[PDB]
Amino acid sequence: MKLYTDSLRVESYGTIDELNSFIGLALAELSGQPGFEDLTAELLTIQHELFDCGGDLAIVTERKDYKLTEESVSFLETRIDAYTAEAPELKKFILPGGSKCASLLHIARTITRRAERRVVALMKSEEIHETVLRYLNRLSDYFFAGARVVNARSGIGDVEYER
Amino acid sequence: KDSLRVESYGTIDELNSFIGLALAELSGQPGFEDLTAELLTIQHELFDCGGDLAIVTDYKLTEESVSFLETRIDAYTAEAPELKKFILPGGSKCASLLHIARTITRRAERRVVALMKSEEIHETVLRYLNRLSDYFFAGARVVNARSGIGDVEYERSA
C-alpha cells in the first residue's frame, strides 16, 4: 500500500526462479509499449541479478564466489527514490492494479515479498549471502515505485483504497 | 512478527495483485461492468482482510461482504449454463485470470487456516476467502458464457 523502505534452500531458489519468470512476463508486456526503455533495461538487470541470488543461495558454496554485489542493492534504492520523485506524490494507500503493466509489476512485488519470506526462513537455519536478503527486501518496493510510475506514464491513476 | 500471520497477509496481497491484473483485463471488454465493480470492491475487502490479520492488539471486514459474495455466486451460477461435469481452468483470457485468482484465493485460505490453528483470528476473513474462491469459479464461468467462449471441460483424448 506504500513504500516499506536443505529444503529451505531449494525453496528459496525455486521462489526466486518463479519471481524471475513473472518479471519476464512484465518485461514482455512492457516491451510492446514505448517510453519504458530504462525500466525494461532495469528489469532485465534484475533478472540477471536474481539469477545471481539463486546461485548465491544454492549453487555457490563459497563466499569468495558470491556474485550478487552490494551496488545492486544501492541501485534498487536510488531507483525507488527516483521513481517516487517522478510519480505524483501519493497521499493515499494503494491497491494492486491500474494498467496491465503496472498490475504485472505489483504481482512481481508480491512474489518478491514471498521470495524474501522464503529467504528469511533460510537465513534462520543457516548462513547465507545476506546481500541477497536486502536485495529482495528493496526489490519489492522497487516494483511498487515502478508500477506507480508505469501507471502515471500511461495516463492511468493508481488504484486507491477509499473506505 | 510470526511467520504464519505474515505469510497470510502476503499471500492475500499476492492474491489482491492477480485480481488487479484480472480487473485490468476485464476492464477492456464490455458486458462486465458488474464483475468489474465487484473485483474493485473485493480488492478493498482483501485490503481489510490483511489488516484484520495484521492486527495483534476492532476489525474492518464485515459479515455482509461474505453474504454479498454468495449472492453473486448464485446470480452467476444461475446465469451460466448448468454444468454436469468437472471444468478445467481456462477459456477466454479473462476467465483464465479469474481462475488463477481462484487458486491463489485457495492458497490464501490454506495459509489463513494454518494461521487460525496457531492463534485467534477474525474468522470472518477465513469465510470471506472460502466464498471468494467460489465467486471466482462462478465469475470465470460467466465470463466465458458472456464472451460466448465456453468452459473447457474434461474431455478424454489423451
Next chain:
Amino acid sequence: KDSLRVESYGTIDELNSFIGLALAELSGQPGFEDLTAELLTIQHELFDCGGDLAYKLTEESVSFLETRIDAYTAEAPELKKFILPGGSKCASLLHIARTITRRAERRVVALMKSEEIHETVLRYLNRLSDYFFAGARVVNARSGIGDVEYERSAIVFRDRNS
C-alpha cells in the same frame, strides 16, 4: 500430515490455471496448434494427478513429455548459454508455468515424507517442468524473438531513450 496433501492439490490446481492462461494467449496465435493440443491434455492429466492424491494418470503420459521435450529441444536452436525466463508473452507464460510446476513438485515431494503416494505424479511434474522449458524456447524460435540469455554485457546495448 494431512495438510501436505491439500497443499499439493491446490498447487497443482494453481499450476493448471496458469496453464489455461498460457493456452488462452497461445491459441490466440497461429503456428502453435501442436502446443495448443498438448497443453490441453496436460491440464486433463494434471486434473488426474490431484485425484490420484485424494489412479487415473499412467506412466504413459510421462513418456509423452519425454518425446515432446527432445523434439522441441532438437527443433529449438541448441543453447550454448544460460537463459532467463521470458521472451514472447507466450514463452513468458510457459516459463511461469515451469517454475510453478516445480513448486508443485516440491509440495508433492513433501507429501512423500508424510506418506508415500502414487509415485507417478512426481515423475510427470518432474518432466512437465522440463517440457515447459523446451516449449517456451520453441515458441520464441517460431516467433523469431529468441530466448532471453544471461548476458550482462549485452544490457548496455539496450535502448535508453528514457
